[PDB]
Amino acid sequence: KVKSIQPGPIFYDVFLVYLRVIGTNLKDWCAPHGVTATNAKSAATGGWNGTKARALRQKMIDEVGEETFLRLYTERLRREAALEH
């Protein structure tokens, strides 16, 4: 059906590439949050799932629009599933 936004590889790429669309990068996005790029990826992929990681994941979603994040994330998943079938 439709999926809600979950962490993982696609979450991380959609956020990473969104920063590119609006012309920042991971490095410069991370700094005002007092966090590392490496910590940003771990939270985004769901590898770190502590509640501090959730707070950061929510900032990534609010950076994109929540609706825009869902649309990018959803259409991307559709394309992978299409190659897997």
Numbering used by the authors: 4 to 88
Quote the authors verbatim:
Anti‐CRISPR (Acr) proteins, which are naturally occurring inhibitors of CRISPR‐Cas systems, have evolved as a counterdefense mechanism employed by bacteriophages and other mobile genetic elements. The AcrVIA6 protein, which targets the type VI‐A CRISPR‐Cas system, has been identified as a potent Cas13a inhibitor. While an initial study suggested that AcrIVA6 is a true anti‐CRISPR protein, another study argued that AcrIVA6 might not be an anti‐CRISPR due to its inability to inhibit Cas13 activity in an in vivo system. However, there is currently conflicting debate regarding the anti‐CRISPR function of AcrVIA6. This study reveals that AcrVIA6 functions as a DNA‐binding protein rather than a Cas13a inhibitor, as it does not block RNA cleavage.
The protein was crystallized, and its structure was solved at 2.39 Å. The high‐resolution structure of AcrVIA6 revealed a five‐helical bundle fold, modeled from residues 4–85. The helices (α1–α5) span residues 12–25, 29–36, 40–48, 54–67, and 69–85. Electrostatic analysis showed predominantly positive charges. Finally, we analyzed the amino acid conservation using the Consurf server to infer functionally important residues in AcrVIA6. This analysis revealed that Q9, P10, and G11, belonging to the N‐terminal loop, as well as F72, Y76, and R79 in the last helix α5, are completely conserved, along with several conserved glycine residues in the middle. The top five hits, including the transcription regulator C.Esp1396I, were all DNA‐binding proteins. Hence, AcrVIA6 exists as a monomer in a solution, unlike other structurally similar DNA‐binding proteins that form dimers. The long N‐terminal loop, impeding dimer formation, is a distinctive feature of AcrVIA6 and contributes to its binding to dsDNA as a monomer. Therefore, AcrVIA6 is a dsDNA‐binding protein that uses the HTH motif, comprising α2 and α3, to bind dsDNA. Using an in vitro Cas13a activity assay, we confirmed that AcrVIA6 fails to inhibit RNA cleavage, even at high concentrations.
